Each structure stands twice: as structure tokens, then as C-alpha cells.
């Protein structure tokens, strides 16, 4: 966390987005707050000027002045609350507007052309973006406004109290106090160095203690066989003794340092203040400033006495407000990193994935109801190569049955099929993205009603454009024998978490119904028929054949061996076999 | 968290341990702090009495009084720092002493007769005790002293300022201010109810937002196949819109409440103070209290004015200090629960484990070099029964080879063998605990030198009592061919984390050497010979036979089939076979 020119450049570049134009509403609050930061100070000086008049009203034993200068305050306290309680409202609204603007900008690009997937899986620059896109934006927006509202009040306070004291005390009055405060602060900060070196040793020792305890807990059974009671007691005792012996020295040092600090920084600033404020009074020949009565010396002293304290506290506040920039640097760096990675991913670039050209070297031509693999070597984007040159073609009305060992490199073939992963050499044909439905073992279910569940890729008005009525939807559901769910929660206006309301077979049949409704050109089945009867499987396959949808089957079951044309058999080492049908089985064994 | 008589009873019962006697050192600080809590107040009143004299020294334009009452402060500020910086030292030392006492008491019982194992595994009342025994003790000790040092300063402050103001103002002076403060506090607290109902809705909505984002991230791949960009954008937008629409109403309510609060609780307390303090002055015929000069009215007013503020702040502090008991209740409850569970486990009781009598029903007789199972049905302490009645005997010079399926109920037999788990009916013989070494696949290694590693159950002086020299240890190490480790880190005075310094085979051979040195009567081998040569295995078995140590083998290997007398074969369903040796193999198949 470093404050340099780069930090300011990054911050201004980010800020250009949250304040786009000159007449946006986020500039209304920027003046509504400026008009109040300069009224709060006037209210403060008025209050300290009126308090002394009230006090001298009674110290002099006169009821008229007391009554008058008390009513002047009673009838004007309501207006002092509005300023203080309107500044805060302005600040809160400004923070919220900043948050909304930044979040909208980020989400307008985080959900563009598979970026949300590539960032999570295909890149490792950012880990767990769901927290970076939720918790960091709020904190950044809060901090960038806290800094502005904390560096701006003390500045006005000192600028007013150093020009209302150069007429009362003199030119040297405030200066001889500022110099002392600066020098004492430097001296104390230099003295207080060792505290920063013991607070790390304390943490190290505490970590050792907790580690020993956890080690004892984990391996309790092994040490319980041969009298593990004695030794471990000694070990924990030794660690605890080291910790408790360090703490005594820490406490003694804190004691001595506090004793010095009190004298230097609490009981000598007051003496300096007394001397500085007293210089005008204890000089009889002073140039005409004070040749007045007691009831004027009283006010003249106490106004200056109360203003020196408020000028001194402002320095402390403005110095303490300088620890916000070191924190803001981290948030600025993180958000700039996120923006850069989004901009990279929106283009054809990526680094730190999960020999031919890595990013992309091929071409994609879009056709209908046809897929062509002619010299298309597919490989993982990490240097490893799955198979050598591959060549085979699949037409419409045929099937591609997958048989062989566990998933292995087949997952890579699936990912590259639906764009997603890159193309390592070769030319290929494909449909336009949304005709390659891929149903996993557990179908994806969203939060919504049954209509959205069946029509998830689309919405309500989209369904209306398709001219499909509720009765047709009933017929589709009845095909997979899901007609008893309409009454399960009342119908199409029921909102429930479908993850723990439907069984696995019900979800799989729901996915089949969704596929039937959408009627895609190509689909992929990955062991999603674990719990289904033979009759339903036969019916869905027959209906799919009647409609004319090409299907891919990873089942490996004998009935599915029967009900497909082609087969792709690989041994894992890398090889593909493509031919019509063998009479008995694949001529290589299993 | 409830404050009742039970809470006080628990707290006093705990406190009886941390202050055992009457002359312990923890009662020295209890008076060293009492003597300072009553000196700090006197210092405060002296300072407010002397400040007004200094101020009237200059307001009256007289240098002598200014000098005199400034030196009276310069020469007495060093003594005011000692009191403040000695009270804190006393408090810190007292907290640390409490922590040490309580931790020693707890660890004197947490490491007694297998309790550290039963609590972790055999009981579920407490989860993860390593944190309860480290972080809760510190927090409890800090809080029980923070309460004492925070409820005791305001009490003395008010008791002094209500008896130094009943002579200056009058009997009604402080009372008419305390009544107003109480009533205004009640009114504000009643008004501020709705803030407690919106801060839960905010958290609910934020949780929903984060949950939707996490759901999007997890299922990105499935939704990337069919145009998942549009819908999910709408869903996140809807949730964010709900949140950002709630926040506006929250901010507006906060604004209005703050506006009311400022007037009621900041700009009217001052008016009440002015009236109350002014009553004595604005009455010419007052009974002789004030018939003096201006330089006495000034002090008489300002002393009372400064004391009313410090009497008013004390109420706020003492009211705010009442939120510590609600927190301390949780710590007291947790520590009492821990103490009760330790006391239960030290006896033959236990509940919520991981039909015959559950806790224990049998008897244990101690013999030497003999083990007898005559009518000993072993079962898990959860109602499940592993096997029916079991009967077989093992002598000295024989072996018990374990053959069969995976671990299954064999782990239960191991645990019950070395005491630990209970005895469900039957009578049994055993040695005295520490003659049943059980070496897992990965031997247990502690933090220490090689001498401790070989001699872990014992120490240095224990080794000296045994009359074993370093050369004998070299010979033991050379037997398992570990003679090249003495120079690996310089010898017997090297401290390293052995987990990542020795390989699996080296650790296993180290365990064999430890077993050879200890020379137990019985030992258990659980698949710890994964990486060992045939020669070393044969040598260790031959040496063990020569020494005369009975061995148990879970290996299931053919050479180990040869080199054992008896065998125990079980099919998992529950059955045990015990006989000398079959010519070919077990007459049941594998």
C-alpha cells in the first residue's frame, strides 16, 4: 500500500465513472455538502461566543442579561440541529449513489459472452470473485467519502481559528502552540518505536501455543496407547511459560512509556496554553486592546481560551485522518486489477490457465444441422496434448455413442464443443451457441415458478411470442409423467427451492421435458439416466427420433448400445474409432 | 444470556478458584488498586479547584497570583501521572494472574487418564476444545476485571460530586438534573425502537444478494451452454434493487431520529444546567453564602459549573458499563459447562456417544504375558452390535494374524483392546496399559531432538536411569539401517519438524526402532509396512522372535501368512475363526 502518482491516477480514473456528467444528481450532493461544511463552523463560533455572554450574565448577578442571552439560544437551537443532521444525510446518500453507479458499471461487463465462466475457471488471476464484486465495492465507496468528509472539517476549523486569534492574541499566539505540538508529536513517535516489535513476537508465541494444542487434539488416539499424559503436559507448560514471561516485560514497558507520555503531552500543553493566552493581559501598557471593565476581560479571556482548544484538537483529527489513504490504496489496487482482467477477458486473451499457438489458431464457420472435424487436434491449454490429429464427420439423423473408460479427456471434448475452451489448430463447423444443450447428472434448477423452470432460457413474454398455451405445457409434462406436480404447490405461481423439493428422477425428467420443449438441433447426455424406467427412456428416444434431433449418449448401456448408429471408443491413451455398427460389439474387447 | 441468581452463583464458584487463600499475591493487587481508585478522584477535584485560581490570576491582571498558582501545578504534575499509570499496571497484572491460575487449574484435569481422548471422540457435548481452552479463558479473565474497573470509578465520582454540590448549590441542585437525565433517557430509548427491526432486514437482504452471487458462480458452466447471460442479470438486478430501495427508507428514518435526539439530549441539558447553577447567584437576599467580591464569585461559579459536567458524564459511563454482564454471562456458562463435562468424564460416565448396560459392565484383571477372551461380546456404544459371543485365547510366543475385508469392526477391537472404549459384558485380562504399543501407517513424531524421538514415552533422566548409552542407541538405529541420520542434522541436539524431514519409510523404520528399544509384551501392526524391503522385515521379525515379544499382524501378505501361527478370519457379517495352521490356506476361499 503505497501513495504515489500511480495511486492518484488510478483513483481519478475510477472516479471518472462515478461522476460522469456535470449535471448528474451526484453533483447535487457535492454542493449540498459544501454549503453545510461552511455553516457548521459558523454555528460553532456563534455558540462559543454566546456561552460566555450567558455565563457573565449570572457571574455579575444580573437577571436581565441572563434572560436575554438565554432566550437568544433557546430560540436558535432548532436551526443548529438541521445543519448537523443534513450534512450526514447528504454524505450517506452520496455514498449510496457511488455504490450503485460502480456496481452497475461492473455488472454491465461481468456478464458478457462467457466472461463469468472464463474468469472463474480459465483464469487464476482473481480467486472467488463473488466476494470481490459484493464486499469490496461497498467498502471502497464508504472509504472514498469518509476521507473527503474527514479531511475537510479540520481544515476549515484551523483556517478560521488561526485568523480569529491573530487579532486577539497576536501573530505568535497560534504559531508558538503549533510548533510545540509538532515537536512533541515527533519526539513521542520516535520514543514509541519498540511497541511495534513486541506485538509481533506476542502473535508468534500465541500461534505456537494454539498450534501445540491443535497437534495434541489431532493425534490424541496415537499417544493414548503409551502414557502420553506426562510429556504433552510438559510441552504445553513450556510454551505457556514462555508466553507469560514475555507478557511481563511488555506490561512494564507500557507502564513506563505511559508515564512519560502523560507528562509530555497532557500536563504541559495546558501550561503552554496558559502562557500564550495570558501574554496580552499581564501587560498594562498594551496598545489599547484592553482598557475596559471586568465584565469584558472575562469574555475576552474565555473566548480565546475556548478557541485554542478547538484549534489544537483539529491538528489531532487531521493527523489521525491520514491513516485512511493507506487502507484506500488496497481497495483501489484490487478494483483496478479487476477492471483490467475484465477488459482482457472481453478480448481473446488469457493468462495463468486453470507446441501450437495457445490462445487461438483456427476458424469457426456457422452452418445448420452439420458438424465437421477435419484436422482438428484438441488439447488442454496447459501444454498437455490429449490426442493427435482427429478426423470424423457426423450428419443429421445419426448418433454418437460414447463408450470407454471414465471421463478422462472427454470432458475437454465437451467443453470445446460448445465454444468455451480454445481451438488448437484446425477448422470446424458449429451452430450458433444455443443449440448444444448439455444436461449433467443433476439438472440446473433456478429460483422461480414452474413456468420459468420449464422455460428457463426464456421468459414470460418470450413464451407468449411462441404461441404456446398452458395446455401444451401440460401435455409436455404429461409425456414424462410429471402431471401430478401441478397440484403439488398449487400450479404455476409457486415459489420454492426446487433443490430439496424434487427428487433426482423428477429433476432428470424435468430436464427431458425442457429439452423436448426447446427442440434443439444437438444435445449431450452425460449419465443423467441413472434413475429412470425402461419405458420412459424408450418413449423419449422414440419421440426425439420422430422430431428429428441428433443426440449424444454417454450411457454405455446395452439397450443404448442397440439404439444408436455410430460409436466412439477410446482407451485413454488416445485413439478414436468411427464406423457404422459391428455385428457383435467393438472388435477390441469390452 | 440472562442475569439471575444462578449467574452470580456460577461466577462466585469460579472466582473461589482464582483467589484461593487470603494472603496470596492476587490480593495484593486488589488493595493496590483500591488505594488508587480513591486517589485519582482527589487528584481530579484538586485540578478543577486549581484551574480556576490560575484563570482568575490573569483575568484580574495580577502577575503574582498567576505565578504562584502556576508553580503549584508545575511542581505537582509528576505525582498526578504516577497514580493514573499505576492503576493500569495493577489492572493488567491482576488480569494476567487470573489467567494463569484458571489455565493451570483446567490443564491439571484435562490431561488425566485418557480424558483428552474421550472428550474429543467419545463425547459430543463440546466441539473443538482447543479453542475453548485457549481463547475463552483470556476473554473471560479480561472481562471479569474490565467490569470491576468500569463499575467502580463512576460510583466514586458521583458519590463525591453529589456531596460537594449539596453545599454549593443546594439539596435540589443535583437531584433536579438526575431526574431530567433519567426521564430523557427513557423517552429516547422508547422512541428508538424501530432501528432494531430494520437492521435484521438489511442483513437478510445482504445474505440473499451474496447467496445469489455464489449460486451464479458455482453453476456457471451449466448455464453457459444455453445463453445464461440475460436471466441471471435480471435476477441480480432485482435483488440489488430491493436492497437499494430499503436503504433509502433506513437513511430517512435515521435522519429524523437524529434531528430529534440532538435537541432533546444535547441543547437542553445545557439549559437545565444553566438554570440549576444560576439559582444561588440571582437571589440577592440569599442566606449569606455570597456577599463577596468578583474574584470570588468567578471561582464559586466555575467550580460548580465544571463539577456538574463530571457528575453528568458519570451516569452515562455507568449506564454504558451495564452491557458487559450480558457478554460475561456467555463466558461463565461456557466455562461452567466445560468444568462439568471434565468432572463427568473423570468418572465412569458419558453421554451423546460419537441391549446390555452401555457405560460399563464387566471386570478387568491384570496379569502378565497373557490375554483371555472368555464370553466377551464387543460392540459399539451406539446400540449397534458387531458380533455375538466371542471366545478365544492367545498365549506368549504365538501370533494373531488378521485376514479379511477392510477395517470394518476391527478398529473397534483395537480401541477396546487398549482400554479406551467401554466393555459390554464379559470378563477379560490385560497388562497395565503401557504394554500395547499400536503403530499406525504414519508413526507419531513429536517436536524435539532424535533422543526424544526414540525415547518419546520417556525423557532424559529416565533414559539415564535405564543405564543406556549413546552407543547402544547407535546400535539400535543401525539395526534398521538408519545410521546415516546422525550426521543429517548434526546429531542428538537438532530441533526440526520431522513431518517433512523424514520419508514414510524412514518414519516407519524409526517406529520399529522405538518398539525394539521399549521391548513391550504386545504390539499391533496396522499396514505400516507399505514401504519396506523383504530383508528388513525378516530381520525385525527374527529379532522380535528372539527377544520374545508377541506380535499382531494386519498385513495380509503371503510371507506374513507364512510367518505367523494363528489367524483370525471374518467376513464382515460377524464371525471369528481361531485355529493353528491350515496346510494350504483358510478353508473358506480367499
Residue pair B59/B134 in contact (Cβ under 8 Å)? The answer is no
User: What Cα–Cα distance (Å) separates residue B55 from each residue in A263, A305, B62, B169?
Assistant: 21, 10, 11, 22
CA distance A284 to A307: 24
Examine the domain organization and report whether B134 and B23 are in the same domain.
Answer: yes
CA distance A112 to A343: 11
Classify B365 in phi/psi space as left (phi over 0), alpha (psi -120 to 50) or beta. beta
Instruction: Tell whether A378 is covered by a domain.
Output: yes
User: What Cα–Cα distance (Å) separates residue A183 from each residue in A201, A578, B447?
Assistant: 31, 86, 51
Q: What is the DSSP string of A324-359?
A: HHHHHHHHHHHHHHHHHHHHHHHTT---S-----SS
Sign of CA dihedral B261, B266, B268, B269: positive
CA distance B230 to B387: 61
Instruction: Tally the C-alpha atoms within 13 A of residue A435's C-alpha that lie toward its C-beta.
Output: 16
Give the count of domains, chain B: 2
**Which long-range contacts (C-beta less than 8 Å, at least 24 apart) are formed by A103-110?**
A103/A133, A103/A137, A103/B240, A105/A17, A106/A133, A106/A137, A106/A338, A106/A339, A106/A342, A107/A133, A107/B233, A107/B236, A107/B237, A109/A342, A109/A346, A110/A342
User: What Cα–Cα distance (Å) separates residue B19 from each residue in B86, B105, B478?
Assistant: 22, 12, 55
Instruction: Tell whether B139 is covered by a domain.
Output: yes
Examine the domain organization and report whether B580 and B564 are in the same domain.
Answer: yes
Q: For testing the chain A interface, which of B123, B224, B433, B441 should be mutated: the one with the most A CBs within 10 Å?
A: B224
Chain A residues in contact with B433 by the CB 8 A cut-off are 227
Reading the block at residue B8, the C-alpha cell is 452470580
| Beta-ladder partners of A371 | A394
Other Cβ atoms closer than 10 A to A538: 12
Reading the block at residue B447, the C-alpha cell is 517436536
Reading the block at residue B305, the C-alpha cell is 459549573
Chain mean position to CA A213: 34
**Which long-range contacts (C-beta less than 8 Å, at least 24 apart) are formed by A201-207?**
A201/A246, A202/A243, A202/A246, A202/A247, A202/A250, A205/A239, A205/A242, A205/A243, A205/A246, A206/A243
CA distance A66 to A68: 6
Chain mean position to CA B75: 48
Question: Which residue of A58, A96, A294 is in closest CB contact with B244?
Answer: A96
Q: How far is B25 from chain A (nearest CA, A)?
A: 15
Instruction: Tally the C-alpha atoms within 13 A of residue B325's C-alpha that lie toward its C-beta.
Output: 13
CA distance A233 to B116: 11
Q: In what order do the strands lie in the sheet with A399-403?
A: A436-439, A522-525, A550-553, A399-403, A566-569
Reading the block at residue B483, the C-alpha cell is 545410521
Question: Which residue of B103, B209, B281 is in closest CB contact with A134?
Answer: B209
**DSSP H or E segment with residue B399:** strand B399-403
Residue pair B588/B569 in contact (Cβ under 8 Å)? The answer is yes
User: What Cα–Cα distance (Å) separates residue B226 from each residue in A421, A549, B357, B361?
Assistant: 15, 16, 61, 65
Exp. method? cryo-EM
- Alpha helices (H) in A480-568, listed in sequence order: 504-518, 534-547, 558-562
Q: Furthest-apart CA pair in chain A: how many Å?
A: 127
Q: For testing the chain A interface, which of B127, B226, B291 should be mutated: the one with the most A CBs within 10 Å?
A: B226
Q: How far is B280 from chain A (nearest CA, A)?
A: 10
Residues across chain A: 590
CA distance B59 to B23: 55
The residue among A84, A302, A73, A44 whose CA lies nearest residue B267 is A73
Chain B residues in contact with A216 by the CB 8 A cut-off are 116, 130
Residue pair A431/A522 in contact (Cβ under 8 Å)? The answer is yes
Question: Which residue of A86, A107, A130 is in closest CB contact with B217?
Answer: A130
Examine the domain organization and report whether A438 and A548 are in the same domain.
Answer: yes
Residues across chain B: 590
Chain B residues in contact with A117 by the CB 8 A cut-off are 220-221, 224
Question: Which residue of B74, B121, B226 is in closest CB contact with A457?
Answer: B226
Q: Report strand pairing: A522-525 vs A550-553.
A: parallel
- Alpha helices (H) in B438-549, listed in sequence order: 450-454, 460-465, 470-479, 504-518, 534-547
Breaks (C-N over 2.5 A) in chain A follow: 354
Phi and psi angles of residue A38, each rounded to the nearest 5 degrees, phi first: -100, -5
CB contacts < 8 A, A to B, total 238
Examine the domain organization and report whether B23 and B112 are in the same domain.
Answer: yes
Chain B residues in contact with A55 by the CB 8 A cut-off are 301, 305
Q: How far is B242 from chain A (nearest CA, A)?
A: 12
Instruction: Tell whether B310 is covered by a domain.
Output: no
Chain B residues in contact with A305 by the CB 8 A cut-off are 55
The residue among A55, A42, A287 whose CA lies nearest residue A167 is A287
CA distance B243 to B207: 10
Question: Which residue of A63, A267, A457 is in closest CB contact with B80?
Answer: A267
Last residue of a domain, one of B354, B374, B406: B354
Tell me if B282 and A58 make a contact (CB, 8 A cut-off).
yes
Instruction: Tell whether A518 is covered by a domain.
Output: yes
CA distance B63 to A279: 11
CATH number at residue A507: 3.40.50.300
Q: Report strand pairing: A424-430 vs A436-439.
A: unpaired
Tell me if B219 and A74 make a contact (CB, 8 A cut-off).
no
Examine the domain organization and report whether A23 and A158 are in the same domain.
Answer: yes
CA distance A18 to A96: 11
Last residue of a domain, one of B354, B377, B399: B354
Q: What is the SS3 assignment for B480?
A: coil
**Where in the sequence is the domain holding B559, given as residue range(s)?**
355-445+502-590
Annotation: binding site of A: 404-411
Examine the domain organization and report whether A292 and A217 are in the same domain.
Answer: no
> Which residue on chain A is closest to B233 by alpha carbon?
A111
Phi and psi angles of residue A390, each rounded to the nearest 5 degrees, phi first: -125, 145
Annotation: binding site of B for ATP: 404-411
Q: What is the DSSP string of B181-208?
A: HHHHHHHHHHHTTTHHHHHHHHHHHHHH
Examine the domain organization and report whether A305 and A246 are in the same domain.
Answer: no
Phi and psi angles of residue A423, each rounded to the nearest 5 degrees, phi first: -115, 115
CA distance A511 to A442: 9
Examine the domain organization and report whether A51 and A128 are in the same domain.
Answer: yes
Q: How far is B2 from chain A (nearest CA, A)?
A: 31
Cβ within 8 Å of residue B359, ≥6 positions away: B348, B349, B350, B422
CA angle A462, A464, A467 (to 5 degrees): 115
Examine the domain organization and report whether B60 and B164 are in the same domain.
Answer: yes
Question: Which residue of B59, B111, B213 is in closest CB contact with A130?
Answer: B213
Chain A residues in contact with B96 by the CB 8 A cut-off are 244, 247-248, 251
Q: Give the CA radius of gyration of chain A.
A: 39
Q: How far is A385 from chain B (nearest CA, A)?
A: 23
Q: For testing the chain B interface, which of A206, A224, A249, A420 should be mutated: the one with the most B CBs within 10 Å?
A: A224
Sign of CA dihedral A140, A145, A147, A150: negative
The residue among A309, A315, A323 whose CA lies nearest residue A185 is A315
CA distance A21 to A579: 65
Tell me if B433 and A113 make a contact (CB, 8 A cut-off).
no
Per-residue HEC secondary structure of A130-187 comes to HHHCCHHHHHHHHHHHHHHHHCCHHHHHHHHHCCCCCCCCCCHHHHHHHHHHHHHHHH
- For residue B209, the 8-state DSSP code is H
Cβ within 8 Å of residue B331, ≥6 positions away: B136, B139, B140, B143
Examine the domain organization and report whether B10 and B58 are in the same domain.
Answer: yes
> Which residue on chain A is closest to B265 by alpha carbon?
A81
Q: What is the SS3 assignment for B374?
A: strand
Sign of CA dihedral A110, A111, A114, A120: positive
Instruction: Tally the C-alpha atoms within 13 A of residue B516's C-alpha that lie toward its C-beta.
Output: 23
Residue pair B48/B161 in contact (Cβ under 8 Å)? The answer is no
Reading the block at residue A131, the C-alpha cell is 466476494
Instruction: Tell whether B112 is covered by a domain.
Output: yes
CA distance A412 to A435: 18
Residue pair B505/B532 in contact (Cβ under 8 Å)? The answer is yes
CA distance A274 to A268: 10
CA distance B501 to B488: 10
Q: What is the DSSP string of B518-556?
A: H--SEEEE-S--SS--HHHHHHHHHHHHHHT-EEEE---
Instruction: Tell whether B456 is covered by a domain.
Output: no
Residue pair A169/A280 in contact (Cβ under 8 Å)? The answer is yes
Chain B residues in contact with A278 by the CB 8 A cut-off are 58, 66
Residue pair A422/A348 in contact (Cβ under 8 Å)? The answer is no
Instruction: Tally the C-alpha atoms within 13 A of residue A454's C-alpha that lie toward its C-beta.
Output: 26
Examine the domain organization and report whether B331 and B432 are in the same domain.
Answer: no
Q: What is the SS3 assignment for B72?
A: helix
Residue pair A295/A56 in contact (Cβ under 8 Å)? The answer is yes
Question: Which residue of A85, A130, A418 is in closest CB contact with B255?
Answer: A85
Residue pair B26/B18 in contact (Cβ under 8 Å)? The answer is yes
Annotation: binding site of B: 404-411
Residue pair B167/B316 in contact (Cβ under 8 Å)? The answer is no
Instruction: Tell whether B510 is covered by a domain.
Output: yes
Instruction: Tell whether A351 is covered by a domain.
Output: no
Residues A229-239: b if buried by 16+ CB within 10 A, e if exposed: eebbbeebeeb
- For residue A17, the 8-state DSSP code is H
| Beta-ladder partners of B437 | B523
Residue pair B495/B451 in contact (Cβ under 8 Å)? The answer is no
Examine the domain organization and report whether A377 and A288 are in the same domain.
Answer: no
Tell me if A81 and B232 make a contact (CB, 8 A cut-off).
no
Reading the block at residue A443, the C-alpha cell is 439438472
Residue pair A110/B228 in contact (Cβ under 8 Å)? The answer is no
Per-residue HEC secondary structure of B107-131 comes to HHHHCCCCHHHHHHHHCCCCCCHHH
Residue pair B204/B242 in contact (Cβ under 8 Å)? The answer is no
Reading the block at residue A47, the C-alpha cell is 455558540
Sign of CA dihedral A272, A273, A274, A275: positive
CA distance B530 to A478: 58
CA distance B351 to B344: 9
Q: What is the DSSP string of B248-281?
A: HHHHHHHHHHHHHHHHHHTSSHHHHHHHHHHTTT
CA distance A252 to A258: 10
Q: How far is B585 from chain A (nearest CA, A)?
A: 33
Last residue of a domain, one of B304, B334, B354: B354
| Beta-ladder partners of B365 | B429
Amino acid at each position: 500500500a503505497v501513495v504515489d502518482k500511480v495511486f492518484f491516477s488510478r483513483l481519478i480514473q475510477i472516479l471518472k465513472i462515478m461522476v460522469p456528467r456535470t449535471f448528474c444528481k451526484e453533483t447535487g450532493y457535492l454542493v449540498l455538502i459544501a454549503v453545510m461544511l461552511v455553516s457548521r463552523t459558523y454555528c460553532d463560533v456563534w455558540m462559543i461566543q454566546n456561552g460566555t455572554l450567558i455565563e457573565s450574565g449570572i457571574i455579575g448577578r444580573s437577571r436581565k442579561d441572563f434572560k436575554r442571552y438565554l432566550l437568544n439560544f433557546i430560540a436558535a437551537m432548532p436551526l443548529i440541529s438541521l445543519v448537523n443532521n443534513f450534512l450526514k444525510y447528504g454524505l450517506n446518500e452520496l455514498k449510496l449513489c457511488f455504490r450503485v453507479r460502480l456496481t452497475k458499471y461492473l455488472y454491465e461487463e461481468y456478464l458478457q459472452a462467457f466472461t463469468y465462466y472464463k474468469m472463474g475457471n480459465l483464469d487464476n488471476r482473481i480467486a472467488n470473485p463473488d466476494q470481490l464484486l459484493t464486499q469490496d465495492v461497498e467498502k471502497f465507496c464508504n472509504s472514498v467519502v469518509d476521507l473527503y468528509s474527514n479531511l475537510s472539517k479540520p481544515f476549515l476549523d484551523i483556517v478560521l481559528y488561526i485568523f480569529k486569534l491573530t487579532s486577539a492574541i497576536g501573530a505568535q499566539g497560534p504559531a508558538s502552540m503549533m510548533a510545540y505540538l509538532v515537536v512533541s508529536g515527533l519526539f513521542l513517535t520516535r520514543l514509541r518505536r519498540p511497541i511495534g516489535k513486541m506485538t509481533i513476537t506476542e502473535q508468534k508465541y500465541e500461534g505456537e501455543y494454539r498450534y501445540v494444542n491443535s497437534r495434541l487434539i489431532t493425534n490424541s488416539e496415537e499417544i493414548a496407547f503409551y502414557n502420553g499424559n506426562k510429556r504433552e503436559k510438559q510441552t504445553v507448560h513450556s510454551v505457556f511459560r514462555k508466553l507469560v514471561e514475555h507478557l511481563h516485560n511488555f506490561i512494564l514497558f507500557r507502564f513506563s512509556m505511559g508515564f512519560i507520555d502523560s507528562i509530555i503531552a497532557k500536563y504541559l500543553a495546558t501550561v503552554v496554553g496558559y502562557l500564550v493566552v495570558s501574554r496580552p493581559f499581564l501587560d498594562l501598557s498594551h496598545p489599547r486592546h484592553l482598557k475596559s471593565t471586568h465584565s469584558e476581560l472575562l469574555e475576552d479571556y474565555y473566548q480565546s481560551g475556548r478557541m485554542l482548544l478547538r484549534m489544537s484538537q483539529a491538528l489531532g483529527r487531521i493527523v489521525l485522518a491520514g491513516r485512511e489513504m493507506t487502507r484506500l490504496a488496497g481497495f483501489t489496487a484490487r478494483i483496478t486489477e479487476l477492471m483490467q482482467v475484465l477488459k482482457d477477458l472481453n478480448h481473446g486473451k488469457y493468462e495463468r490457465t486453470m507446441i501450437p499457438l495457445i490462445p487461438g489458431a483456427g476458424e469457426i464457420i456457422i452452418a445448420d444441422n452439420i458438424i465437421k472435424f477435419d484436422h482438428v487436434p484438441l488439447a488442454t491449454p496447459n501444454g498437455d496434448v490429449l490426442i493427435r490429429d482427429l478426423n470424423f464427420e457426423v450428419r443429421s439423423g445419426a448418433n454418437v455413442l460414447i463408450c470407454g473408460p471414465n471421463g478422462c479427456g472427454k470432458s475437454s471434448l465437451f467443453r470445446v464443443l460448445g465454444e468455451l475452451w480454445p481451438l488448437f489448430g484446425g477448422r470446424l463447423t458449429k451452430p450458433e451457441r444455443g443449440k448444444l444443450f448439455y444436461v449433467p447428472q443433476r439438472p440446473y434448477m433456478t429460483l422461480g415458478t414452474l413456468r420459468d423452470q420449464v422455460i428457463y432460457p426464456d421468459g414470460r413474454e418470450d413464451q407468449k411470442r411462441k404461441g404456446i398455451s398452458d395446455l401444451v405445457l401440460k401435455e409436455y409434462l404429461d409425456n414424462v409423467q410429471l402431471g401430478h406436480i401441478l397440484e403439488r404447490e398449487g400450479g404455476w405461481d409457486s415459489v420454492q427451492d426446487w433443490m430439496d423439493v424434487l427428487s433426482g428422477g423428477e429433476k432428470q425428467r424435468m430436464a427431458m421435458a425442457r429439452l423436448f420443449y426447446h427442440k434443439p438441433q444437438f444435445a449431450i447426455l452425460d449419465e443423467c439416466t441413472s434413475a429412470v424406467s425402461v419405458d420412459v427412456e424408450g418413449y423419449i428416444y422414440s419421440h426425439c427420433r420422430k422430431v428429428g434431433i441428433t443426440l449424444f449418449t454417454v450411457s454405455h448401456r446395452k439397450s443404448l448400445w442397440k439404439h444408436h448408429e455410430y460409436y466412439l471408443h477410446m482407451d485413454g491413451r488416445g485413439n478414436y474409432e468411427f464406423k457404422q455398427i459391428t455385428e457383435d460389439t467393438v472388435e477390441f474387447g469390452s
